[PDB]
């Protein structure tokens, strides 16, 4: 893989992210490296209408522009949602509207936070030379203190980091149906479950760095978007840019493209029929940097290793599969499990909904098993 | 183009598609072949509630897994619809629902009758050494007598081909590009442009084929699904496959690749803000073929033509172009003065939301238009 910027250590995330911009961006700056202080003292929006509509110009690499999104991204949420009780905002300062909507376009994102914006390219080592481990790591913003944010970005962040090694033999499998190789296969569909088995460890770090009731008080008001939701029913204005409300959806890691391309090389019915679910995960691909979509399209144009597998009649090489298919139900299973935990029970001091969908998902995988005749 | 499933003369139609089943199917092909006499006689439900549970497993390839959906697909919306005097079926029986759901998923198709049943694999050609003519050709199923659905669906088709030819040429487009062989380019968009043109004579026929009256009040039921109709809020139960009512849309034109196809390669935006239009045709990709599916989604994988227009200041180009892009706007508007007469003037002796649709989309297109009128 190449033109499909998927590192080989870091996989779907951005490699190196940038920490500051061309200080041409400072008005920028400050305000999302103080976004907490600002939100609490509602000195935020106050902020957001006095800076002036900067030019996307003087961003030059696409790390700076990856940047540049994470920064008007997180100011956006935060100018919307406001303190999080109810006060919300529905114009978007063009100052702020315009030259976001600019670089969303030139990047083919949409002009709202997106996990590849601050999970993907919200982060840094504090020591360079030491590996890339929750202790050596942190995000580059967070929206309140304690608002559990770390945590949740960046254990996101550490399980697509323990995918990419199973994104690398994906290529492998690809060939080895091709060059009719068996015995390569079996090895390759090995690695990936093996894979997969090790980033459900990763998983249980969740427990460890976040706080159910502050994660489910705080962090759920900033991934909120604009599209269906009773709070802005219409959509979003963005001054400047847009006469009309647009409906943009809020944060969500259907957005990956690590689950999404297991799902994809293991042919599971993930985006097929119309059902909410298969809906939703394929506008999801919207959501994602375009090469990454663009690599999900290539996987989906190559043949069926479900299929091949099937028509093989061979059972070490049904096993190696179903190996596979379950290291994907455990991590939803388990992920299911947190979603109890951090949410469903903080409501209970919307998320039935939100069961159903994850269920759904977690069922077509199990559907998947071959030997389930 | 390899496996994309595209003809070389027919395009996203099927090449020559089957007219009969194996015999074990004969139960089948007796009511879909007779719904009209079925239907209107009373006795269609009861025909079909008097069936055997039949294995699709003795439908073995490609086209006779595509015929098998074309007659389910027919039954199906006979049963549920009956005469469409209002007496609907919310209930698929189990010797139905169940081989046209395993179909339906072996072939990554919704079940429900779609685009690519009715239109892309319901003929036949009559004398085979003939060519491709209205003349020459038939449909293989309909519903009432005076439904007009052969002139319907024939129509579509022979547009659906003439554009084929503009389909040959995409490649050399994208070779074209990256060679920067300028000359080339012109000469390819100037061809594309020329098959549009062609394609809109053909719309012509439709006048010859299809009657306002006959159209309106009766092929309209058929076409129904069970999305959002009021008639079946809740959706169709699938007996024995699903726990559940599913709910599927309605036969759309949106479900045809060929204008979506494009769409993409001219760099219109069918996906402009996340607007009702784009949306939906967005949705219609899921209830189309996978190959074709992919070949839309890898379209959008290689550099906008627009993109390279616009940046060379060439006139010659930029009319070439403009040319393509106003054979777009052309069909569009020829399709909704017909629209005009077969469903707003019938439906006046709910209608105005297809108008909108329409209008965005044609409105759309229009806004693509290198030189501004
Ligand atoms: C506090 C911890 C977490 C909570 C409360 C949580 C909650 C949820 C919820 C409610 C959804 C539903 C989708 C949506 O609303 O858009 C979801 C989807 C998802 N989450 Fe999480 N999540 C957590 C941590 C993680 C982590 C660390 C990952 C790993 C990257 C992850 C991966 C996913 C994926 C891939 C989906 C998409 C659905 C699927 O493929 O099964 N989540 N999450
Ligand atoms: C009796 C003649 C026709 C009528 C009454 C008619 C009606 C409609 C209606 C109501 C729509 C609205 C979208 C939807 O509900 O799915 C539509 C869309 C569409 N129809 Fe037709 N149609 C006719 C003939 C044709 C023919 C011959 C073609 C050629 C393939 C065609 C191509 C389309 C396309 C591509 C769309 C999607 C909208 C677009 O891309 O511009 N239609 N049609
Ligand atoms: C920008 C961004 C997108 C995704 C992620 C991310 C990383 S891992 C994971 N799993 N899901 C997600 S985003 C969906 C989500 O958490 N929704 C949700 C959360 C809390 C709630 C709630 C719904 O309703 C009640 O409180 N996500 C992080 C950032
Ligand atoms: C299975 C199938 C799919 C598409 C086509 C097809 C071929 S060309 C074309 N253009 N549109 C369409 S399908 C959409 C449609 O007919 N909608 C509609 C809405 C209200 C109406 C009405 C029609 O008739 C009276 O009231 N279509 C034919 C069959």
């Given at each position: 893989?190449?033109?499909?910027?998927?590192?080989?250590?870091?996989?779907?995330?951005?490699?190196?992210?940038?920490?500051?911009?061309?200080?041409?961006?400072?008005?920028?700056?400050?305000?999302?490296?103080?976004?907490?202080?600002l939100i609490?003292?509602?000195?935020?929006?106050?902020?957001?209408?006095?800076?002036?509509?900067?030019?996307?110009?003087?961003?030059?690499?696409?790390?700076?522009?990856?940047?540049?999104?994470?920064?008007?991204?997180?100011?956006?949420?935060?100018?919307?949602?406001?303190?999080?009780?109810?006060?919300?905002?529905?114009?978007?300062?063009?100052?702020?509207?315009?030259?976001?909507?600019?670089?969303?376009?030139?990047?083919?994102?949409?002009?709202?936070?997106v996990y590849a914006d601050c999970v993907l390219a919200n982060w840094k080592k504090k020591d360079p030379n030491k590996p890339l481990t929750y202790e050596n790591m942190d995000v580059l913003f967070s929206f309140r203190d304690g608002d559990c944010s770390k945590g949740?970005?960046?254990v996101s962040l550490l399980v697509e980091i323990a995918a990419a090694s199973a994104i690398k033999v994906?290529?492998?499998?690809?060939?080895?149906?091709?060059?009719?190789?068996?015995?390569?296969?079996?090895?390759?569909?090995?690695?990936?479950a093996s894979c997969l088995e090790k980033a459900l460890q990763v998983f249980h770090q969740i427990h460890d760095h976040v706080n159910p009731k502050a994660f489910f008080s705080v962090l759920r008001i900033y991934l909120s978007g604009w599209k269906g939701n009773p709070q802005l029913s219409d959509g979003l204005v963005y001054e400047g840019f847009w006469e009309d409300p647009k409906e943009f959806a809020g944060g969500s890691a259907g957005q990956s493209?690590?689950?999404?391309?297991?799902?994809?090389?293991?042919g599971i019915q993930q985006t097929a029929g119309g059902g909410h679910a298969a809906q939703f995960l394929q506008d999801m691909?919207?959501?994602?940097?375009?090469?990454?979509?663009?690599?999900?399209?290539?996987?989906?144009?190559?043949?069926?290793?479900?299929?091949?597998?099937?028509?093989?009649?061979?059972?070490?090489?049904?096993?190696?599969?179903?190996?596979?298919?379950?290291?994907?139900?455990?991590?939803?299973?388990?992920?299911?499990?947190?979603?109890?935990?951090?949410?469903?029970?903080?409501?209970?001091?919307?998320?039935?909904?939100?069961?159903?969908?994850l269920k759904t998902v977690r069922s077509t995988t199990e559907k998947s098993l071959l030997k389930e005749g």
């Open positions: 893989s190449k033109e499909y910027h998927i590192d080989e250590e870091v996989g779907f995330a951005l490699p190196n992210p940038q920490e500051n911009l061309p200080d041409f961006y400072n008005d920028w700056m400050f305000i999302a490296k103080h976004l907490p202080d609490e003292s509602g000195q935020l929006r106050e902020r957001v209408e006095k800076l002036n509509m900067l030019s996307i110009d003087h961003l030059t690499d696409h790390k700076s522009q990856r940047l540049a999104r994470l920064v008007l991204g997180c100011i956006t949420m935060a100018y919307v949602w406001g303190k999080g009780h109810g006060d919300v905002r529905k114009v978007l300062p063009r100052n702020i509207a315009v030259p976001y909507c600019q670089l969303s376009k030139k990047l083919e994102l949409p002009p709202i936070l949740f970005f960046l994906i290529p492998t499998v690809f060939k080895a149906m091709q060059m009719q190789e068996r015995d390569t296969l079996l090895k390759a569909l090995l690695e990936i493209s690590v689950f999404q391309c297991f799902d994809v090389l293991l691909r919207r959501y994602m940097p375009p090469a990454h979509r663009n690599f999900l399209c290539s996987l989906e144009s190559n043949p069926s290793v479900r299929e091949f597998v099937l028509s093989k009649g061979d059972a070490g090489l049904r096993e190696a599969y179903d190996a596979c298919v379950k290291a994907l139900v455990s991590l939803r299973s388990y992920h299911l499990q947190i979603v109890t935990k951090y949410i469903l029970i903080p409501a209970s001091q919307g998320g039935t909904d939100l069961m159903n969908f």
